[PDB]
Coordinates of C-alpha atoms and ligand atoms in Angstrom, one line a residue:
Chain A
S1 CA -1.4 19.5 15.0
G2 CA 0.9 16.5 15.3
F3 CA 5.6 17.4 15.8
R4 CA 8.4 14.8 14.2
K5 CA 11.4 14.7 13.4
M6 CA 11.3 16.4 9.7
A7 CA 14.5 16.4 7.5
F8 CA 14.6 19.4 4.3
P9 CA 13.2 17.6 1.1
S10 CA 16.9 16.1 0.1
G11 CA 16.3 16.4 -3.9
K12 CA 18.2 19.7 -4.7
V13 CA 21.6 17.5 -3.1
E14 CA 20.1 13.9 -4.3
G15 CA 21.7 15.7 -7.9
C16 CA 25.2 16.8 -6.9
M17 CA 26.4 12.8 -5.1
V18 CA 28.8 11.4 -7.0
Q19 CA 31.7 7.7 -6.6
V20 CA 34.4 8.3 -6.7
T21 CA 37.5 5.8 -6.5
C22 CA 41.3 5.8 -5.5
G23 CA 42.8 2.4 -5.8
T24 CA 40.4 0.5 -3.4
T25 CA 39.3 2.4 -1.4
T26 CA 35.2 4.2 -3.2
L27 CA 33.4 7.2 -1.2
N28 CA 31.2 9.8 -1.4
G29 CA 31.3 12.6 -2.9
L30 CA 29.3 16.2 -3.8
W31 CA 29.6 17.4 -7.2
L32 CA 29.3 21.7 -7.9
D33 CA 29.8 23.7 -10.7
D34 CA 32.9 22.0 -12.0
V35 CA 34.6 20.6 -8.2
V36 CA 34.1 17.4 -6.9
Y37 CA 34.8 17.4 -2.8
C38 CA 35.5 14.6 -1.1
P39 CA 37.4 13.3 3.0
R40 CA 41.0 13.4 1.7
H41 CA 41.7 9.8 4.2
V42 CA 40.0 8.9 -0.7
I43 CA 43.3 8.4 -1.4
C44 CA 44.3 5.9 2.1
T45 CA 45.2 2.6 2.2
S46 CA 44.7 1.0 5.5
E47 CA 48.4 0.3 6.2
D48 CA 48.4 4.5 5.5
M49 CA 45.3 4.9 7.5
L50 CA 47.6 4.5 10.3
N51 CA 49.9 7.6 10.2
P52 CA 48.8 9.1 6.4
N53 CA 52.2 12.0 5.3
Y54 CA 48.6 13.3 2.9
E55 CA 50.9 15.1 1.1
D56 CA 53.2 12.6 0.0
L57 CA 50.3 10.5 -0.6
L58 CA 48.0 13.0 -3.5
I59 CA 52.1 14.8 -5.1
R60 CA 52.4 11.0 -6.5
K61 CA 49.1 10.5 -7.0
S62 CA 47.3 12.1 -10.7
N63 CA 44.8 13.0 -11.6
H64 CA 43.9 9.4 -13.5
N65 CA 43.8 7.9 -10.7
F66 CA 40.7 9.4 -9.5
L67 CA 37.8 7.5 -11.1
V68 CA 34.3 9.6 -10.5
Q69 CA 31.5 8.4 -11.2
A70 CA 27.9 10.7 -12.0
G71 CA 26.2 7.6 -12.3
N72 CA 26.6 5.5 -15.0
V73 CA 29.0 9.0 -16.3
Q74 CA 32.4 8.9 -16.1
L75 CA 33.5 12.7 -15.3
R76 CA 37.2 13.4 -16.4
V77 CA 39.1 14.8 -13.6
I78 CA 41.7 18.2 -14.9
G79 CA 43.5 18.9 -12.1
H80 CA 43.4 17.8 -7.9
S81 CA 44.1 20.1 -4.8
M82 CA 43.6 19.7 -0.9
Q83 CA 42.4 22.1 1.0
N84 CA 42.1 20.7 5.7
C85 CA 40.9 17.8 5.4
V86 CA 38.4 17.5 1.6
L87 CA 40.6 17.0 -1.6
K88 CA 38.7 18.8 -4.4
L89 CA 39.1 16.9 -7.5
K90 CA 38.5 20.2 -10.9
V91 CA 35.9 17.9 -13.7
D92 CA 35.9 19.1 -17.2
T93 CA 32.6 19.0 -16.9
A94 CA 30.3 22.0 -14.4
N95 CA 27.1 19.9 -12.5
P96 CA 23.9 20.9 -15.0
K97 CA 22.3 20.5 -11.4
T98 CA 23.8 22.6 -9.2
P99 CA 21.8 24.4 -6.5
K100 CA 22.3 27.3 -5.1
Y101 CA 24.2 27.3 -2.7
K102 CA 26.6 28.1 -0.1
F103 CA 29.4 26.5 2.6
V104 CA 28.3 27.7 6.1
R105 CA 30.0 26.2 10.0
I106 CA 27.4 25.4 12.0
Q107 CA 26.6 25.7 15.7
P108 CA 26.7 23.5 18.7
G109 CA 23.3 22.7 19.3
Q110 CA 22.0 23.6 15.6
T111 CA 20.6 20.4 13.7
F112 CA 20.6 20.0 9.9
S113 CA 19.8 17.4 7.1
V114 CA 21.9 14.4 6.6
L115 CA 21.5 13.1 3.2
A116 CA 22.9 9.4 4.1
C117 CA 25.0 8.0 0.4
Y118 CA 26.9 4.6 -0.5
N119 CA 28.3 4.7 -3.9
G120 CA 27.5 7.5 -4.8
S121 CA 23.7 6.7 -4.6
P122 CA 21.5 8.4 -1.7
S123 CA 20.5 5.8 0.2
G124 CA 18.0 7.7 4.1
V125 CA 17.8 11.1 4.8
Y126 CA 17.4 12.3 8.8
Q127 CA 17.5 15.1 10.3
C128 CA 21.2 16.0 13.2
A129 CA 22.5 18.1 15.5
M130 CA 25.6 18.6 16.5
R131 CA 26.3 18.1 19.4
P132 CA 28.5 20.3 22.2
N133 CA 30.4 17.6 21.9
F134 CA 31.2 18.6 18.1
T135 CA 30.1 14.6 17.5
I136 CA 26.6 14.0 16.1
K137 CA 24.4 11.1 16.8
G138 CA 23.8 9.9 12.9
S139 CA 23.0 6.7 11.6
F140 CA 26.3 5.7 9.0
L141 CA 27.7 2.2 7.7
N142 CA 30.8 1.5 5.5
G143 CA 30.8 3.7 2.8
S144 CA 28.6 6.4 4.2
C145 CA 31.7 8.5 4.1
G146 CA 31.8 11.4 2.4
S147 CA 27.6 12.3 3.3
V148 CA 27.1 15.6 3.6
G149 CA 25.1 18.0 6.1
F150 CA 22.9 20.3 4.9
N151 CA 20.1 23.0 5.8
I152 CA 18.0 25.0 2.8
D153 CA 17.1 28.4 3.1
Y154 CA 14.4 29.6 0.5
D155 CA 16.6 28.3 -2.2
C156 CA 19.6 28.1 -1.6
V157 CA 21.5 25.4 0.3
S158 CA 23.5 25.2 2.8
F159 CA 25.9 23.0 2.7
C160 CA 27.3 22.5 7.1
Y161 CA 28.8 18.8 7.0
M162 CA 30.8 16.0 5.5
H163 CA 30.9 12.7 7.0
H164 CA 34.5 11.0 8.1
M165 CA 34.1 8.4 10.5
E166 CA 32.7 7.1 13.2
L167 CA 33.9 6.7 16.9
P168 CA 33.7 3.5 18.9
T169 CA 30.5 5.2 20.8
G170 CA 28.8 4.4 18.1
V171 CA 28.7 8.5 17.0
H172 CA 30.0 10.5 14.3
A173 CA 32.8 12.9 13.4
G174 CA 33.8 15.8 10.0
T175 CA 34.4 18.7 8.6
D176 CA 32.3 21.3 6.9
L177 CA 32.2 21.2 3.6
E178 CA 36.6 23.6 4.5
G179 CA 37.8 20.8 5.6
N180 CA 37.8 21.9 9.0
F181 CA 36.7 19.3 11.9
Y182 CA 34.3 20.2 14.3
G183 CA 35.8 18.4 17.7
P184 CA 38.7 17.0 18.2
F185 CA 39.8 14.7 16.0
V186 CA 42.0 13.5 13.3
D187 CA 41.4 12.0 9.5
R188 CA 43.2 8.8 11.1
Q189 CA 43.0 5.7 12.4
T190 CA 44.3 6.1 16.1
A191 CA 42.6 6.4 19.9
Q192 CA 39.9 8.9 19.5
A193 CA 36.6 9.9 21.9
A194 CA 34.3 11.4 22.9
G195 CA 34.1 13.6 25.0
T196 CA 30.7 13.4 27.7
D197 CA 28.3 15.1 26.5
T198 CA 25.8 17.8 27.5
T199 CA 22.7 18.5 26.8
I200 CA 21.6 21.3 25.0
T201 CA 18.9 24.0 27.2
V202 CA 17.6 25.9 24.8
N203 CA 16.4 23.8 22.4
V204 CA 14.3 21.7 25.4
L205 CA 12.5 24.6 25.9
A206 CA 11.7 24.9 22.5
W207 CA 10.6 21.4 22.0
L208 CA 8.5 21.8 25.2
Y209 CA 6.9 25.2 23.1
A210 CA 6.7 22.5 20.2
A211 CA 4.3 20.3 23.0
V212 CA 2.4 23.4 23.9
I213 CA 1.4 24.1 20.8
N214 CA 0.8 20.1 20.7
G215 CA -1.6 20.5 23.4
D216 CA 1.0 18.3 25.8
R217 CA 0.7 21.1 28.6
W218 CA 0.3 18.7 31.5
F219 CA 4.8 19.9 32.6
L220 CA 3.4 23.9 32.9
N221 CA 2.6 25.5 36.3
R222 CA 2.5 28.7 37.8
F223 CA 5.7 28.9 38.9
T224 CA 8.6 31.3 37.1
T225 CA 12.4 31.4 38.2
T226 CA 15.5 33.4 37.2
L227 CA 18.2 32.5 33.8
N228 CA 20.8 32.8 37.5
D229 CA 18.4 29.9 39.8
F230 CA 18.5 27.8 36.6
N231 CA 21.7 27.7 36.0
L232 CA 22.5 25.8 38.8
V233 CA 20.0 23.6 38.6
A234 CA 21.0 23.3 34.4
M235 CA 25.1 22.6 35.3
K236 CA 23.7 19.9 38.2
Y237 CA 22.1 18.0 35.4
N238 CA 24.7 18.4 32.8
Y239 CA 22.5 21.5 30.9
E240 CA 24.8 23.7 28.8
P241 CA 23.5 27.2 30.6
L242 CA 20.8 29.3 29.7
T243 CA 22.5 32.8 28.0
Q244 CA 20.2 36.5 27.6
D245 CA 20.7 35.2 23.6
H246 CA 18.4 31.9 24.5
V247 CA 15.9 33.4 25.7
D248 CA 15.8 36.3 23.1
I249 CA 15.0 33.5 20.2
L250 CA 12.3 32.1 22.4
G251 CA 11.0 34.8 22.1
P252 CA 8.6 33.9 19.4
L253 CA 7.2 31.1 20.8
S254 CA 7.2 32.7 24.4
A255 CA 4.4 35.3 22.7
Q256 CA 2.6 32.9 20.5
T257 CA 1.9 30.4 23.5
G258 CA 1.6 32.9 26.8
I259 CA 4.6 31.1 28.5
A260 CA 7.8 33.0 29.3
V261 CA 10.8 31.3 28.8
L262 CA 11.7 31.6 32.7
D263 CA 7.9 30.3 33.5
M264 CA 8.5 27.5 30.8
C265 CA 12.3 27.4 33.2
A266 CA 10.0 26.8 35.8
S267 CA 9.0 23.4 34.3
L268 CA 12.0 22.4 33.1
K269 CA 13.4 22.8 36.3
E270 CA 10.6 20.6 37.8
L271 CA 11.1 18.0 35.4
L272 CA 14.6 17.2 35.5
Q273 CA 14.3 17.4 39.4
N274 CA 11.5 14.9 39.7
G275 CA 11.3 13.5 36.1
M276 CA 8.1 12.7 34.4
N277 CA 5.4 10.9 36.5
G278 CA 5.2 8.5 34.1
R279 CA 3.9 11.0 31.0
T280 CA 5.4 11.8 27.9
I281 CA 5.4 14.7 26.3
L282 CA 5.5 14.3 21.7
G283 CA 5.5 10.9 22.4
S284 CA 8.6 11.4 24.5
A285 CA 9.5 9.9 27.9
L286 CA 12.6 12.0 27.1
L287 CA 14.1 15.5 26.9
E288 CA 14.4 15.9 23.7
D289 CA 16.7 18.5 22.6
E290 CA 18.1 18.2 19.0
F291 CA 14.7 21.1 17.4
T292 CA 16.2 24.4 17.4
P293 CA 13.4 27.0 18.0
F294 CA 14.3 27.4 14.0
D295 CA 12.4 23.6 14.3
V296 CA 9.9 25.0 16.0
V297 CA 8.4 27.3 14.0
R298 CA 9.3 26.2 11.0
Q299 CA 8.1 22.9 11.3
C300 CA 5.3 24.5 13.2
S301 CA 3.9 27.3 11.0
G302 CA 4.2 25.3 7.2
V303 CA 7.7 26.7 6.0
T304 CA 8.1 25.8 1.3
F305 CA 10.9 26.3 0.1
Chain B
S1 CA 26.2 2.3 14.5
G2 CA 23.7 4.7 14.9
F3 CA 19.9 4.2 14.7
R4 CA 17.3 7.2 13.6
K5 CA 14.3 7.2 12.6
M6 CA 15.4 7.5 8.3
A7 CA 13.5 8.6 4.9
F8 CA 13.4 8.3 1.7
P9 CA 15.4 11.2 -0.3
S10 CA 13.0 12.4 -1.4
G11 CA 14.0 13.7 -5.1
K12 CA 12.3 11.2 -6.9
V13 CA 8.8 13.1 -5.4
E14 CA 9.8 16.9 -5.4
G15 CA 9.8 16.7 -8.7
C16 CA 6.6 15.7 -9.1
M17 CA 4.5 17.8 -7.1
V18 CA 2.0 19.9 -7.5
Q19 CA 0.0 23.5 -6.9
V20 CA -4.5 22.2 -7.8
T21 CA -6.6 24.7 -7.3
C22 CA -10.5 24.4 -8.1
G23 CA -12.9 27.6 -6.5
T24 CA -11.3 29.1 -3.7
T25 CA -9.3 26.0 -2.5
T26 CA -6.2 25.0 -3.6
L27 CA -4.5 21.8 -2.4
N28 CA -1.2 19.8 -2.9
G29 CA -1.4 16.7 -6.5
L30 CA 1.1 14.4 -7.8
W31 CA 1.8 15.0 -11.5
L32 CA 2.7 11.3 -13.1
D33 CA 2.8 11.4 -16.6
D34 CA 0.5 12.9 -18.0
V35 CA -2.7 12.7 -14.5
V36 CA -2.1 14.4 -11.7
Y37 CA -3.9 13.0 -8.7
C38 CA -5.7 15.3 -5.5
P39 CA -8.4 15.3 -3.1
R40 CA -11.7 15.4 -4.2
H41 CA -12.1 17.6 -1.3
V42 CA -11.0 19.9 -4.0
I43 CA -14.5 20.8 -5.3
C44 CA -16.0 20.8 -2.4
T45 CA -17.6 24.6 -0.8
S46 CA -18.2 26.1 2.3
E47 CA -21.7 24.4 2.3
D48 CA -20.5 21.6 0.6
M49 CA -18.8 20.1 3.1
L50 CA -21.2 17.6 5.0
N51 CA -22.4 15.3 2.8
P52 CA -21.2 16.7 -0.5
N53 CA -22.0 14.6 -4.0
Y54 CA -19.3 14.5 -5.5
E55 CA -20.6 12.3 -9.2
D56 CA -23.0 16.2 -8.9
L57 CA -20.2 18.7 -8.1
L58 CA -17.7 17.2 -10.7
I59 CA -20.4 16.4 -13.3
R60 CA -21.4 20.8 -13.0
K61 CA -16.7 21.5 -13.4
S62 CA -15.3 21.6 -17.2
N63 CA -11.9 20.9 -17.1
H64 CA -10.7 25.0 -17.5
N65 CA -11.7 24.8 -13.6
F66 CA -9.2 24.0 -12.4
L67 CA -6.1 25.7 -11.9
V68 CA -2.8 23.1 -12.2
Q69 CA 0.6 25.2 -11.5
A70 CA 4.2 23.2 -11.1
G71 CA 6.3 25.3 -10.2
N72 CA 5.8 29.1 -12.9
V73 CA 4.5 26.8 -15.1
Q74 CA 0.7 26.7 -15.7
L75 CA -0.5 23.4 -17.5
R76 CA -3.1 22.6 -18.9
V77 CA -6.3 20.0 -18.0
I78 CA -7.8 18.2 -20.8
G79 CA -9.5 15.0 -19.2
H80 CA -11.1 14.8 -15.5
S81 CA -12.3 11.2 -14.0
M82 CA -12.8 10.9 -10.0
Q83 CA -11.9 7.5 -8.6
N84 CA -12.9 7.0 -5.1
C85 CA -11.9 9.6 -3.6
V86 CA -8.9 10.1 -5.7
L87 CA -9.7 13.6 -8.8
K88 CA -7.8 12.8 -11.7
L89 CA -7.2 15.2 -14.1
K90 CA -5.2 14.6 -17.4
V91 CA -2.9 16.8 -18.8
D92 CA -1.6 17.7 -22.1
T93 CA 1.8 17.6 -21.1
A94 CA 3.4 14.2 -19.9
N95 CA 5.7 15.0 -16.2
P96 CA 9.4 15.4 -18.0
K97 CA 10.7 14.3 -14.3
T98 CA 8.2 11.2 -13.4
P99 CA 10.5 9.3 -11.9
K100 CA 9.7 4.8 -12.5
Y101 CA 6.4 4.3 -9.6
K102 CA 4.1 1.9 -8.9
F103 CA 0.8 2.1 -6.6
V104 CA 1.1 -0.2 -3.6
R105 CA -1.5 -0.6 -1.1
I106 CA -0.5 -1.1 2.6
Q107 CA -1.4 -2.7 5.4
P108 CA -1.2 -1.5 9.4
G109 CA 1.9 -1.4 10.6
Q110 CA 4.1 -0.7 7.5
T111 CA 6.5 2.5 7.4
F112 CA 6.2 5.0 4.7
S113 CA 8.2 8.5 3.9
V114 CA 6.3 11.8 4.1
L115 CA 6.8 14.3 1.9
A116 CA 5.5 17.6 3.7
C117 CA 4.1 19.7 1.5
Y118 CA 2.0 23.3 0.9
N119 CA 0.8 25.2 -2.6
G120 CA 2.5 22.0 -4.3
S121 CA 6.4 23.6 -2.5
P122 CA 8.2 20.5 -0.6
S123 CA 8.7 22.1 3.5
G124 CA 10.2 18.2 5.0
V125 CA 10.4 14.7 5.3
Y126 CA 9.4 12.6 7.2
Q127 CA 9.1 8.9 9.1
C128 CA 6.0 7.2 9.2
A129 CA 3.8 4.0 9.9
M130 CA -0.1 2.9 9.4
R131 CA -1.4 2.8 12.9
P132 CA -3.3 -0.4 13.5
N133 CA -6.4 2.0 13.6
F134 CA -5.8 3.0 10.2
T135 CA -4.5 6.3 10.9
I136 CA -1.0 8.4 10.4
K137 CA 0.5 10.4 13.7
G138 CA 1.8 12.9 10.9
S139 CA 2.5 16.9 10.8
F140 CA 0.1 18.6 9.0
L141 CA -0.4 22.0 9.1
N142 CA -3.6 23.5 7.5
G143 CA -3.5 23.1 3.2
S144 CA -1.0 19.6 3.4
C145 CA -3.8 18.5 1.4
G146 CA -3.0 15.7 -1.8
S147 CA 0.6 15.2 0.2
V148 CA 2.1 12.0 -0.6
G149 CA 4.1 8.9 1.1
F150 CA 6.4 6.5 -0.5
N151 CA 8.1 3.8 0.0
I152 CA 11.8 3.9 -2.9
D153 CA 12.9 0.3 -2.9
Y154 CA 15.5 0.0 -6.0
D155 CA 15.0 3.5 -8.2
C156 CA 10.8 2.3 -8.2
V157 CA 8.6 4.3 -6.1
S158 CA 5.4 3.0 -4.9
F159 CA 2.7 5.4 -3.7
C160 CA 1.2 4.1 -0.6
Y161 CA -0.8 7.2 1.3
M162 CA -2.2 10.2 0.0
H163 CA -3.0 12.8 2.8
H164 CA -7.1 13.5 3.1
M165 CA -7.5 15.4 6.8
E166 CA -6.9 15.5 10.3
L167 CA -9.3 14.0 13.0
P168 CA -10.1 15.1 15.9
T169 CA -7.2 13.4 18.8
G170 CA -4.7 15.0 15.9
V171 CA -3.7 11.6 14.0
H172 CA -4.4 11.6 10.2
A173 CA -6.5 10.0 7.4
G174 CA -6.1 9.0 3.4
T175 CA -6.5 7.0 0.9
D176 CA -3.6 5.3 -0.8
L177 CA -3.3 6.2 -4.9
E178 CA -6.1 4.8 -5.7
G179 CA -8.2 6.9 -4.2
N180 CA -9.6 4.0 -1.3
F181 CA -9.5 5.2 2.3
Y182 CA -7.3 3.7 4.8
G183 CA -9.6 2.5 8.6
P184 CA -13.4 3.6 7.9
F185 CA -13.1 7.2 7.7
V186 CA -14.9 9.1 4.5
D187 CA -14.0 12.5 3.1
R188 CA -16.8 14.3 4.9
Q189 CA -16.9 16.7 8.1
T190 CA -19.5 14.4 9.9
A191 CA -18.5 13.3 13.1
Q192 CA -15.8 11.3 12.8
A193 CA -13.0 9.3 15.4
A194 CA -9.9 6.9 15.6
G195 CA -10.3 3.6 16.9
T196 CA -8.5 3.1 20.1
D197 CA -5.3 2.4 18.7
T198 CA -2.3 -0.7 20.0
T199 CA 1.3 -0.7 19.3
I200 CA 2.7 -2.3 16.5
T201 CA 4.3 -5.8 18.5
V202 CA 6.0 -7.2 15.4
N203 CA 8.1 -3.8 14.8
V204 CA 9.3 -3.1 19.0
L205 CA 10.5 -6.5 18.6
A206 CA 11.9 -6.0 15.6
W207 CA 14.1 -2.1 17.0
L208 CA 15.2 -4.9 20.3
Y209 CA 16.7 -7.1 17.2
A210 CA 18.3 -3.7 15.8
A211 CA 19.6 -2.6 19.5
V212 CA 21.3 -6.0 20.3
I213 CA 22.6 -5.1 16.4
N214 CA 24.3 -2.3 17.9
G215 CA 25.9 -4.2 20.8
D216 CA 22.5 -3.7 24.0
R217 CA 21.5 -7.2 25.8
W218 CA 21.1 -5.5 29.0
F219 CA 17.6 -6.2 28.7
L220 CA 17.2 -9.7 27.5
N221 CA 16.6 -12.7 29.2
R222 CA 17.0 -16.5 30.3
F223 CA 13.4 -17.1 29.7
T224 CA 11.7 -18.0 26.9
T225 CA 7.6 -18.2 25.9
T226 CA 5.2 -19.5 23.5
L227 CA 2.9 -17.5 20.7
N228 CA -0.6 -17.7 23.2
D229 CA 1.1 -17.0 25.9
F230 CA 3.2 -14.1 24.9
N231 CA -0.3 -13.0 23.7
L232 CA -1.9 -13.1 26.4
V233 CA 0.4 -10.9 28.1
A234 CA 1.6 -8.1 25.6
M235 CA -2.5 -7.3 24.6
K236 CA -3.0 -6.3 29.0
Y237 CA -0.7 -3.5 27.4
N238 CA -2.5 -3.1 24.1
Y239 CA 0.2 -4.1 21.8
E240 CA -1.3 -5.8 18.6
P241 CA -1.7 -9.9 18.5
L242 CA 2.1 -11.4 16.9
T243 CA 1.2 -13.6 14.7
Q244 CA 3.2 -16.5 12.8
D245 CA 3.6 -14.0 9.6
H246 CA 5.6 -11.7 12.3
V247 CA 7.9 -14.5 13.7
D248 CA 8.6 -16.0 10.0
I249 CA 9.1 -12.7 9.5
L250 CA 11.7 -11.9 12.6
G251 CA 13.7 -15.4 10.6
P252 CA 16.4 -13.1 9.5
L253 CA 17.1 -10.8 12.6
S254 CA 16.8 -13.8 14.7
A255 CA 19.2 -15.8 12.6
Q256 CA 21.7 -12.6 13.1
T257 CA 21.2 -12.4 16.4
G258 CA 21.3 -15.8 17.4
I259 CA 18.4 -15.1 19.7
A260 CA 15.3 -17.6 19.1
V261 CA 12.3 -15.1 18.4
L262 CA 10.3 -16.4 21.0
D263 CA 13.3 -15.2 23.0
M264 CA 13.1 -11.8 22.1
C265 CA 8.8 -12.3 23.0
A266 CA 10.2 -13.6 26.3
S267 CA 12.8 -10.0 27.1
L268 CA 9.9 -7.8 25.9
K269 CA 7.2 -9.2 28.4
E270 CA 9.7 -8.4 31.2
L271 CA 10.1 -4.9 29.5
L272 CA 6.6 -4.5 30.1
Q273 CA 6.8 -5.7 32.5
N274 CA 9.7 -3.7 34.0
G275 CA 9.8 -0.9 32.2
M276 CA 13.5 0.5 31.9
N277 CA 14.6 1.3 35.1
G278 CA 16.3 5.1 33.2
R279 CA 18.0 2.9 30.9
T280 CA 17.5 3.9 27.1
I281 CA 17.4 1.4 24.1
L282 CA 19.0 3.4 20.6
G283 CA 18.7 6.5 22.8
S284 CA 14.7 6.2 23.3
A285 CA 13.2 5.9 26.7
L286 CA 9.6 3.9 24.9
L287 CA 9.7 1.3 23.0
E288 CA 10.0 2.0 19.5
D289 CA 7.1 0.6 17.3
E290 CA 7.8 2.3 14.3
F291 CA 11.2 0.6 12.4
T292 CA 9.8 -2.7 10.3
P293 CA 11.7 -5.8 9.9
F294 CA 12.5 -4.6 6.8
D295 CA 13.2 -1.0 7.5
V296 CA 15.6 -2.5 10.1
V297 CA 17.6 -5.0 7.4
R298 CA 17.9 -1.8 5.2
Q299 CA 19.2 0.0 7.7
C300 CA 21.5 -1.7 10.1
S301 CA 25.0 -3.3 10.2
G302 CA 24.8 -7.9 8.0
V303 CA 27.9 -7.7 11.4
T304 CA 26.6 -8.3 14.6
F305 CA 28.0 -6.0 17.4
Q306 CA 28.8 -9.2 20.1
Ligands
R9M401 O1 34.5 4.9 6.5 C1 32.9 5.5 6.0 O2 33.0 4.8 4.9 C2 32.6 6.7 7.1 C3 33.1 6.1 8.5 C4 32.0 5.0 9.0 N1 31.2 5.5 9.9 C5 30.3 4.5 10.4 C6 30.6 3.2 9.7 S1 31.9 3.4 9.2
R9M402 O1 -21.7 21.7 5.1 C1 -23.2 21.6 4.9 O2 -23.8 20.9 4.3 C2 -24.4 23.5 5.2 C3 -22.7 23.3 6.2 C4 -23.8 25.1 6.7 N1 -22.9 25.4 6.0 C5 -23.7 26.8 6.2 C6 -25.3 26.9 6.3 S1 -25.9 25.2 6.4
R9M403 O1 -5.4 18.9 5.2 C1 -6.2 19.9 4.9 O2 -5.4 20.7 3.9 C2 -7.1 20.7 5.7 C3 -7.4 20.1 6.9 C4 -5.7 19.0 7.6 N1 -5.4 18.8 7.4 C5 -4.1 18.5 7.9 C6 -4.8 19.5 9.1 S1 -5.8 19.7 9.2
CL404 CL1 2.4 -3.7 3.6
NA405 NA1 5.8 27.6 34.7

């Protein structure tokens, strides 16, 4: 029993974290095979960050201008290239701790583990959702840049996120490992704001299924609804529309608990309209939307990699 | 710049997790140097559940009755002893992945990371607190016994918890790594129940300090309180008594925010009276009690968002 916000075990990713320094800028890199991945803005000063020409700044740099440190070991850089907003530094040594991995781009509403790092040293691990507005509600300080996000599937690490910046509202923005931003952000010192966010409906429903599996049942009711009726309520409450694909994904939890997705939507309708009437669900007084259906099945059945 | 339940990186503990089998019972063990630590109840059978005599069950085992598997490698058991409720199996190989480590017994209110494991394989990592009633609110299914709790301050792993059992309310009980239970619990299937739990007052205050560091002041007030008047109010909401030790421990957070500890106490008194009026603090609509003053200083900025 019990339901907790749970990260993937971080050991496979800890063995890949290095320190990258260019001039006075130090941040984290990801050392896989013979390449170190890091944000391209490592080559910038503060002056540069106002209106940077990355092409221009990089051609003026050579391999020896990148200091890469793996624990107390200096790696020899033998090449440097840019892919979108990520810098790739070829080193003369393959990382002997490289796990089986691939690069994946996640969808809004999907979850991942962040390994928060400073100076190439892992500091903490926590679970995040890619928000509908493509930010993450992370916990990051100066030096966290190049910290990475990932999932594990069997023995394969799927890298999905590299940390680039904090927004004025205290939320965070970054790229996939191919250097493509999540959301309408750029790597420059300029005016940028998180768009108005929305609640991830399919995840709230998953979390209500988690609650029922853990004996929290007060919110259940005799009623059912339709996708169209529910989606009018969703729109009003700044909830994402529920699709047939989402209903299908919750199929397992519907079956296991005997509450149909639209049976649970009728619960969620009542909660949005009426509140929790002083009650809690799984120790929260808010409707939690950072657990996916997979997260709930996974945690409630003890999958292990 | 954000505030999250953050666990320690789990890699140094992952490299220590093994499977222990005795009879038909398999759970997790912790392989440090040439010793594997696991719950002694691995030697129990379907009848020896209510009133097991561990000394009598153990003297009937040879080293070769314990199957210890580190991934695909079988370890050879060359010695066994019991210390309180923990079994120690001496093995003929020291774990090459043993980190710098120590064993520490924690007090209620302290936090730690749990590496939930099944069949000696890690499933996930999350943060817990030792509750005032000596339980933890974990996420544990059948086969998770031998899963451990730890902190990592400065490359040294401090092991503080080993998971033994789930109580009827769905909360979790276990031991330190010397095998002494936290709380009045025993490794027997006799009827056991957690005491009435209380809120960890010092941690709620630390978290309110966290909220101020991250730029939120809406819940503050112009009032102060005596420590005694605070405790008379707080206990009416099932809050732990705040001691002068707890006041002292909050001094650095008080200094960083310029909010006196007893002024923050007056803010907490008012929040208990009013609730949050549909507002949130650090993403919660409840008062969070599983962040310590040390956790807030580790995670939060040295500079306050004024
Ligand atoms: O500057 C960095 O290291 C990354 C962006 C930030 N994230 C949080 C605070 S500053
Ligand atoms: O746990 C015990 O000591 C007895 C349990 C039993 N099982 C069958 C008969 S009596
Ligand atoms: O610990 C075990 O492996 C059996 C009893 C349980 N402990 C936690 C959930 S069920
Ligand atoms: Cl302690
Ligand atoms: Na219903």
